[PDB]
């Protein structure tokens, strides 16, 4: 007769990804030969950054957050 | 007669994925050769930050939090 | 008789990604020779940076977050 | 009638002289020798020798292969 | 009637001199040697070598092949 | 009737003379050698030799190769 047959049925296999910062890098044998600083005197003051022959990896990932919002709704 | 089938059956298989910072690098043998700093007097005063010769890897990841909001509904 | 049949199946199967930042980069054997500062004396003050024979590697990623929304409906 | 004779002779020298062979060294002299270092930095392998005489010999190869096949068929 | 006489005869030399025969070293002089080496830097593989007075030698070859097939076929 | 008398004579020679032969060294002198070196950068191979006297000999030829094939066919 009126009979009524509803299959609500998604499907979801999706991927949300971030991938932020510093991935898979190479650093081989990095280094200078020579650094040489020869003075009298060495007066630093007031928010002085000094770096003399260094090495820095610096990174800051305030981001790269993800954010999924999904909604289902069957009304009869 | 009048019957009614309802088959509600959503499948979620997602992936939501965050990869922030410092992942898969590779550092291979650095830093330098000769570093030499020849002076009388070093006078450092109200924020001096000094670096000689260091290798330094910071990392700071303040982000990278995933978040999901799924709802699902059925009125009859 | 009036038999009504409905099938709400929506398939999902996309891709949200972001790589932000510093990706697969290979660096072989960087560094300069011989770097020299021979001075009378050495004055900073008032926000001086000063970088002598170093090797940096910076990232900042404010961003490269993803964002998915995505709603469903029947109604009858 | 049917007659055959295999006789070959074979005398042959197969000589190899490879090398440092008969010489003669009369009083050599080795020097005075030195090394100073400092603030080296060697980042992968490092193979040294230092000395005041030497003497040094390498044969990697002279090496003798000799081959011979002697075959009779009848019929 | 048929009659073979296969009789050849081999005085061969296959001789091979290679490398440093029959010299004369009268008081040969090695000289002195200094060195000074400060703040090097290698990245990669090194071979130093450091002496007075040296002799070297070095035979990668200097080897001897023979071959010889012999055949005698009848009918 | 028949009669076959294969019969050769070999009295070959194959010499080979490579190298440093029969030489005479009265008296070589090596000089004084100073070597000061400082702030080198080397990024990669380094093949360092240094001396005062000196004798090389390389051979990386020098073999010999021979070859000989005889044949007697009948009928």
Request: with cysteine; aromatic share 4%; hydrophobic share 25%.
């Amino acid at each position: 007769g009126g009979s009524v047959q509803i299959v609500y049925k998604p499907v979801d296999l999706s991927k949300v990804t971030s991938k932020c910062g510093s991935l898979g890098n190479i650093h081989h044998k990095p280094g200078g030969g020579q650094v040489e600083v020869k003075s009298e005197k060495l007066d630093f003051k007031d928010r002085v950054q000094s770096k003399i022959g260094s090495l820095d990896n610096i990174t800051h990932v305030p981001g790269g957050g993800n954010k999924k919002i999904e909604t289902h709704k069957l009304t009869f």
